[PDB]
Design an enzyme around this catalytic site. Structure first.
Site, PDB file in Angstrom:
ATOM      1  N   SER A  12     -31.330  42.477 -18.787  1.00 23.83           N
ATOM      2  CA  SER A  12     -32.291  41.929 -17.852  1.00 23.83           C
ATOM      3  C   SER A  12     -33.259  43.022 -17.395  1.00 23.83           C
ATOM      4  O   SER A  12     -33.061  44.213 -17.646  1.00 23.83           O
ATOM      5  CB  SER A  12     -31.574  41.305 -16.655  1.00 23.83           C
ATOM      6  OG  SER A  12     -30.754  42.255 -16.007  1.00 23.83           O
TER       7      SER A  12
ATOM      8  N   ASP B 125     -36.018  44.207 -13.987  1.00 25.45           N
ATOM      9  CA  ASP B 125     -36.415  44.066 -12.587  1.00 25.45           C
ATOM     10  C   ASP B 125     -37.931  44.205 -12.464  1.00 25.45           C
ATOM     11  O   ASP B 125     -38.531  45.076 -13.097  1.00 25.45           O
ATOM     12  CB  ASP B 125     -35.736  45.123 -11.714  1.00 25.45           C
ATOM     13  CG  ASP B 125     -34.235  45.137 -11.875  1.00 25.45           C
ATOM     14  OD1 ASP B 125     -33.638  44.055 -11.964  1.00 25.45           O
ATOM     15  OD2 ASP B 125     -33.654  46.239 -11.925  1.00 25.45           O
TER      16      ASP B 125
ATOM     17  N   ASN C  50     -34.739  40.557 -10.151  1.00 28.56           N
ATOM     18  CA  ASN C  50     -34.006  40.648 -11.413  1.00 28.56           C
ATOM     19  C   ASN C  50     -34.130  39.359 -12.223  1.00 28.56           C
ATOM     20  O   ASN C  50     -33.876  38.267 -11.706  1.00 28.56           O
ATOM     21  CB  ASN C  50     -32.535  40.944 -11.108  1.00 28.56           C
ATOM     22  CG  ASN C  50     -31.707  41.226 -12.349  1.00 28.56           C
ATOM     23  OD1 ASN C  50     -32.154  41.028 -13.476  1.00 28.56           O
ATOM     24  ND2 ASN C  50     -30.479  41.689 -12.138  1.00 28.56           N
TER      25      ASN C  50
ATOM     26  N   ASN D 127     -32.373  46.791 -17.070  1.00 27.95           N
ATOM     27  CA  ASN D 127     -30.967  46.930 -16.718  1.00 27.95           C
ATOM     28  C   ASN D 127     -30.103  47.006 -17.972  1.00 27.95           C
ATOM     29  O   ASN D 127     -30.515  46.611 -19.062  1.00 27.95           O
ATOM     30  CB  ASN D 127     -30.510  45.757 -15.853  1.00 27.95           C
ATOM     31  CG  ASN D 127     -31.307  45.632 -14.571  1.00 27.95           C
ATOM     32  OD1 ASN D 127     -31.583  46.622 -13.901  1.00 27.95           O
ATOM     33  ND2 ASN D 127     -31.682  44.408 -14.224  1.00 27.95           N
TER      34      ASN D 127
ATOM     35  N   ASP E 257     -27.597  45.272 -18.842  1.00 29.42           N
ATOM     36  CA  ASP E 257     -27.217  43.980 -19.403  1.00 29.42           C
ATOM     37  C   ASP E 257     -28.353  43.294 -20.155  1.00 29.42           C
ATOM     38  O   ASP E 257     -28.163  42.175 -20.640  1.00 29.42           O
ATOM     39  CB  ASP E 257     -26.682  43.055 -18.298  1.00 29.42           C
ATOM     40  CG  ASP E 257     -27.737  42.680 -17.266  1.00 29.42           C
ATOM     41  OD1 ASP E 257     -28.900  43.109 -17.396  1.00 29.42           O
ATOM     42  OD2 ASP E 257     -27.394  41.952 -16.310  1.00 29.42           O
TER      43      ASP E 257
ATOM     44  N   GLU F 265     -37.405  50.852  -3.915  1.00 27.54           N
ATOM     45  CA  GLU F 265     -37.280  50.051  -5.128  1.00 27.54           C
ATOM     46  C   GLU F 265     -38.415  50.335  -6.104  1.00 27.54           C
ATOM     47  O   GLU F 265     -38.190  50.411  -7.314  1.00 27.54           O
ATOM     48  CB  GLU F 265     -37.256  48.563  -4.782  1.00 27.54           C
ATOM     49  CG  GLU F 265     -35.990  48.085  -4.074  1.00 27.54           C
ATOM     50  CD  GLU F 265     -34.773  48.052  -4.986  1.00 27.54           C
ATOM     51  OE1 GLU F 265     -34.927  48.208  -6.213  1.00 27.54           O
ATOM     52  OE2 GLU F 265     -33.651  47.868  -4.464  1.00 27.54           O
TER      53      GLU F 265
END
Ligand SMILES: CC(=O)N[C@@H]1[C@@H](O)[C@H](O[C@@H]2O[C@H](CO)[C@@H](O[C@@H]3O[C@H](CO)[C@@H](O)[C@H](O)[C@H]3NC(C)=O)[C@H](O)[C@H]2NC(C)=O)[C@@H](CO)O[C@H]1O
Ligand SMILES: [Cl-]
Ligand SMILES: [Cl-]
Ligand SMILES: [Cl-]
Ligand code: NA
Length: 129
Positions: free
Chosen positions: A50, A52, A59, A46, A48, A35
């Site tokens: 958002s 991380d 998220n 991301n 959309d 990750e």
């Protein structure tokens, strides 16, 4: 902070992740590697809108507030910036809530695609735990 493999394993064990909800320590170390490459400061955006955050790439759509993900939740009740600390306590406590929410560690895409079904115990080989 960029953790070493065995350094991170020892920190995660001290914070109660070894076998938390049946997931052995190697699962959590493997997930962290893919990750974030063991880097607490990692961020990724991301599609959309958002973002991380941190060593486990938590998220902002669901788990923390960063002030720029309009219709999102804050289920861990923390600013997302708290997840970038060299102290992993906040990231661990939030991860415990995530993994208990129904889907287990499948909430981490890299765990599902790169750790699940592999010999995860190899990620803690040689460490004093
Ligand atoms: C590490 C991380 O942030 N991972 C993100 C995932 O958490 C996220 O997946 C979505 O997570 C939410 C919250 O856990 C899921 O909602 C839950 O769904 C289960 C059904 O399986 C239900 O039992 C729970 O009640 C419900 N909780 C709430 C609060 O509604 C949601 O289903 C997950 N969605 C998917 C497609 O897996 C994904 C996607 O946003 O992003 C990751 O980064
Ligand atoms: Cl293990
Ligand atoms: Cl599970
Ligand atoms: Cl991934
Ligand atoms: Na949010």
């Amino acid at each position: 902070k960029v953790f070493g493999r065995c350094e991170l394993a020892a920190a995660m064990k001290r914070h109660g992740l070894d076998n938390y909800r049946g997931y052995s320590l190697g699962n959590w170390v493997c997930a962290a590697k893919f990750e974030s490459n063991f880097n607490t400061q990692a961020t990724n955006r991301n599609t959309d809108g958002s973002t991380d955050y941190g060593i486990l790439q938590i998220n902002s759509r669901w788990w923390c507030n960063d002030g720029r993900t309009p219709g999102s939740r804050n289920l861990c009740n923390i600013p997302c910036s708290a997840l970038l600390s060299s102290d992993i306590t906040a990231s661990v406590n939030c991860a415990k809530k995530i993994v208990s929410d129904g889907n287990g560690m499948n909430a981490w895409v890299a765990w599902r695609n790169r750790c699940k079904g592999t010999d995860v115990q190899a990620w803690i080989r040689g460490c004093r735990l």
